[PDB]
C-alpha cells in the first residue's frame, strides 16, 4: 500500500523526504502521461505501468493492498507469505525504490506543469 511504499523509499533513500518523489516529472505521483523527463521519471513510469498490470489481477488494488516486506541492513525483501496480488505489488514497489536510489534528482523537474509539459 502507499504507506509501505513510502517506508521503502525512507529505507532506500534516507537523505531525502519521500515527498520529493510525490510530484516529480511526468510520472512520479499524480502524473501518468507524455515523455518521461529524466531517469528518475523513467523509474516512475515503469512503476506506474507495473501497477496497471497488477490491477488486472481480480480484486488487486495496488494503492491499498497491504503486502509483507522487510527493510533491514540495507536490504529490501518482499517476503514469501504474499499472495499473487501482494507479491506483484510488493515487487513493483521494491523495484521502484531501488530505482529511485540510483537515479539523479533534478530540482528543476520537481512540480512541473503537467498540462503543458506531459502531452
Amino acid at each position: 500500500n502507499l504507506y509501505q511504499f513510502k517506508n521503502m523509499i525512507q529505507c532506500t533513500v534516507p537523505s531525502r523526504s519521500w515527498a520529493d518523489f510525490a510530484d516529480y516529472g511526468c510520472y512520479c505521483g499524480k502524473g501518468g502521461s507524455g515523455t518521461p523527463v529524466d531517469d528518475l521519471d523513467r523509474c516512475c513510469q515503469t512503476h506506474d505501468n507495473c501497477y496497471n498490470e497488477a490491477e488486472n489481477i481480480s480484486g488487486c488494488r495496488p494503492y491499498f493492498k497491504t503486502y509483507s516486506y522487510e527493510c533491514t541492513q540495507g536490504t529490501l525483501t518482499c517476503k514469501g507469505d504474499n499472495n499473487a496480488c501482494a507479491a506483484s505489488v510488493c515487487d513493483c514497489d521494491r523495484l521502484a525504490a531501488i530505482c529511485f536510489a540510483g537515479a539523479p534528482y533534478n530540482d528543476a523537474n520537481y512540480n512541473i506543469d503537467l498540462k503543458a509539459r506531459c502531452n
Binding site: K6, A22, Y27, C28, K30, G32, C44, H47, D48
Partner: peptide, 8 residues
Amino acid sequence: KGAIIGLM
C-alpha cells in the same frame, strides 16, 4: 495512509 498520493 488515507489521503494519497503517488504513483499509479
